[PDB]
Design a protein around this ligand. Structure first.
Ligand SMILES: *[C@@H]1O[C@H](CO)[C@@H](O[C@@H]2O[C@H](CO)[C@@H](O[C@@H]3O[C@H](CO[C@H]4O[C@H](CO)[C@@H](O)[C@H](O)[C@@H]4O)[C@@H](O)[C@H](O[C@H]4O[C@H](CO)[C@@H](O)[C@H](O)[C@@H]4O)[C@@H]3O)[C@H](O)[C@H]2NC(C)=O)[C@H](O)[C@H]1NC(C)=O
Ligand SMILES: CC(=O)N[C@H]1[C@H]([C@H](O)[C@H](O)CO)O[C@@](OC[C@H]2O[C@@H](O)[C@H](O)[C@@H](O)[C@H]2O)(C(=O)O)C[C@@H]1O
Length: 306
């Protein structure tokens, strides 16, 4: 029973580095030899592991200027460092360990892409206007030798809101995260948000893009005929209610005169026939969707005597 604790799969790209936190417990006790293979192959005939050796405790254990470094010890630490990492390093890292009475091979998968891979934006399934939402950008990479930055963009412009970067680099998980808190408005709907990955000097590396879907109450434009909203008694007045933006789709419409609802006016058009001076006042329409009700600007109807 050999117990190992490591991220089990590490990601990087050509020219960057990888840092592999690793602890272990050998019930047999202290180690006597350590070999780090790359893509180790097992020889059934000789009962030994063949393949490329990247580190040997007998030979490489040094000059401090070495691409592959073993940073652990013969006890409880198996931390590895490859700086820089190459596409040829991609595959199986085989930690060939031997205790006094037993030998163990612990494999750690290393996935290296030729170019930087994009980050991943995670956002809640329902985003509503005027509620603080945290956008999360997640990159499955973090290495000391290669500092990086995550940059938020809105329609190609750097976003005003401060974003907070945090990095995990543990036996459990390796990532770089950026969280941006902002309250979206109805105008943010349909816009694109970009999370840019940059190196320490701001050089563009990769990016992920999402188009925002922001729920909002209906936004309305009211129009009146005649346009000046001034009529004599007996004339006819027509007011229409137009939905400029609504997410999701609107479901009901109502009309109000001076704060009181006009009964049986449940269409997007209000027709006042043979108007009396009574019907002067302030008019508006209200359109509701699943998010809530919206109201248009008020129209001041002036019915002048005779
Ligand atoms: C197994 O045992 C080993 C040996 O002790 C432990 O190794 C140490 O690991 C820590 C991190 O867990 C290392 O700290 C980090 O080292 C990075 C590499 O720095 C080297 O290169 C720079 C640049 O040339 C040198 O200046 C430096 O002296 C090293 O030679 C740094 O890049 C890191 O910097 C980051 O963190 C520091 C905070 O400490 C910040 O100030 C920085 O801004 C940056 O954010 C950091 O210094 C440490 O160097 C390792 N020690 C050795 C001797 O290698 C393992 O941790 C252990 N494993 C487990 C699982 O316990
Ligand atoms: C404690 C113990 O079981 N040691 C085994 C060791 C472990 O099973 C292995 O390191 C765990 O990953 O395997 C040894 O065999 C490796 C060899 O086993 C074949 O069955 C397999 O087809 C090969 O791919 C290869 O894994 C070892 O020496 O490392 C034997 C040892 O007793």
């Amino acid at each position: 029973k050999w117990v190992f604790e490591h991220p089990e799969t590490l990601y990087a790209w050509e020219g960057a580095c990888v840092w592999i936190p690793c602890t272990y417990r050998a019930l047999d006790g202290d180690l006597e030899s350590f070999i780090l293979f790359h893509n180790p192959e097992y020889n059934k005939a000789t009962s030994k592991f063949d393949g490329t050796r990247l580190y040997e405790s007998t030979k490489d254990g040094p000059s401090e200027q070495k691409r592959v470094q073993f940073l652990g010890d013969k006890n409880k630490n198996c931390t590895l460092s490859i700086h820089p990492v190459h596409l040829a390093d991609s595959g199986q890292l085989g930690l060939r360990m031997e205790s006094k009475t037993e030998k163990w091979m612990e494999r750690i998968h290393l996935a290296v892409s030729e170019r930087p891979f994009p980050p991943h934006i995670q956002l809640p399934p329902e985003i509503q206007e005027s509620q603080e939402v945290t956008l999360t950008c997640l990159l499955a990479f973090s290495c000391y030798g290669y500092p990086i930055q995550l940059q938020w963009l809105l329609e190609g412009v750097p976003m005003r809101q401060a974003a907070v970067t945090s990095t995990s680099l543990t036996i459990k998980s390796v990532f770089t995260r950026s969280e941006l808190k902002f309250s979206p408005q109805w105008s943010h709907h349909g816009k694109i948000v970009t999370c840019q990955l940059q190196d320490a000097d701001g050089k563009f590396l990769s990016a992920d893009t999402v188009q925002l879907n922001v729920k909002h109450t209906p936004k309305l434009e009211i129009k009146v005929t005649p346009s000046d909203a001034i009529v004599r008694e007996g004339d006819s007045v027509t007011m229409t209610c137009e939905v400029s933006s609504s997410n999701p789709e609107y479901t009901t419409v109502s009309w109000l005169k001076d704060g009181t609802s006009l009964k049986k006016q449940n269409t997007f058009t209000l027709n006042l026939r043979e108007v009396t001076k009574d019907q002067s006042g302030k008019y508006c329409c209200q359109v509701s969707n699943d998010v809530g009700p919206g109201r248009s600007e008020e129209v001041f109807l002036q019915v002048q005597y005779a």
